[PDB]
Design a protein around this ligand. Sequence first.
Ligand SMILES: *P(=O)(OC(C)C)OC(C)C
Ligand SMILES: *P(=O)(OC(C)C)OC(C)C
Lengths: 228, 228
Amino acid sequence: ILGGREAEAHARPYMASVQLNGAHLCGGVLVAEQWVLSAAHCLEDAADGKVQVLLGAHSLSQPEPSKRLYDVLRAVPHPDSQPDTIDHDLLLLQLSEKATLGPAVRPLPWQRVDRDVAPGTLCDVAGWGIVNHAGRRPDSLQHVLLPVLDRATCNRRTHHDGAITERLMCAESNRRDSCKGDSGGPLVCGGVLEGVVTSGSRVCGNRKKPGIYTRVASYAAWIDSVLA
Amino acid sequence: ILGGREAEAHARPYMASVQLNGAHLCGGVLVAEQWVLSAAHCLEDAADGKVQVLLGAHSLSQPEPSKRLYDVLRAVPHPDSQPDTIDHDLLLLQLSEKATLGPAVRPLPWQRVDRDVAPGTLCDVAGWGIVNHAGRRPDSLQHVLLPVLDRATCNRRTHHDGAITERLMCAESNRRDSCKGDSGGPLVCGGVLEGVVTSGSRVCGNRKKPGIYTRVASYAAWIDSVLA
Ligand SMILES: *P(=O)(OC(C)C)OC(C)C
Ligand SMILES: *P(=O)(OC(C)C)OC(C)C
């Protein structure tokens, strides 16, 4: 997260850390007792590497009572995601066993009404990804409150040039934004999961290129089918 | 709402006011584009009286652009409820038309994971019900942060004499409590809808009588079947 502050210890019990071979890879959101939502592009270059989910964490390194590592039984990427595209960039991960819920670990329901978030609305994004341009990776969870931009504005030529489809939404990126390592994480508006940080190569914090987020209500039916 | 404070203008887009002949009767929660969730007992003796739902409000009297009154097309009470019990006190109201959404109007999803909120957790309850024992009704929305009580303690003989089941929960009521007119309102924990204020004739702000809330997760199947 660029331009944000450190988040309160475990004020977001739904936050997860998708790891590849023991290192933080992407954020994720516990959406059910044994499922985590993340970004499909996060697993692109996984290979033989092992993928695990960390729960109840604030510090990626220091031992915490609430922390627990879980292996993954199955990684279900959305059928229509592609390595060369930012559409349908969703991924579901089934934990090896139900999570042990507590004050520091609990699922967050996602929006099911397929209506856009109103521009101007401040949404919270949290993550362990890039903190600055030097590439500094933080040890603790950070977060920022960003305003939602109108798609008409976001699709302007000199902006995303009409690439933001109806399944996508934009938020500002002027000196505040989500960067590498924040992909797969949640965009919580008013306490509700409205989006997921979309994976793709982008400079962090350029006002001319607003952040792109996958609208989770646009995929409510798919999420439901996988979790059956 | 005894012992709380005025809520931030329209920071709870899902908050609804259920009215009988143009007067605030109970609270509600916008739960889908055309449905509001409330308490069954609220409409105990309403019958053919004119019922309506007020969305986008903060002040019950002053004009605000976001305010809009809707007529109720269908009132669906939980089929297992009976006038003499606080059990299955849920009611779904179908609005006359899909609610027009915007910054101050938006649905809130309910927790689907049927698990207890840990005791000691602080949850938020909002409403336009009585603010003191003199029965003074406020003009604008109020709210309070309340600690969740464990069911065993709430079930104590001095409290709710074995009345609290697995579909119910409690919160402390020592001079901070929901009250008359607050029924049907939301019990939100960490931004998640976790309960609906139970309607019943009960004393306000008394430590020996904890506030009782209906757990929505244990009714998710009923809700889903009605909204489809
Ligand atoms: P995400 O962590 O962040 C992009 C928005 C730069 O995706 C990476 C893994 C390419
Ligand atoms: P609710 O507002 O009452 C309890 C919270 C005390 O239901 C009324 C309308 C009877």
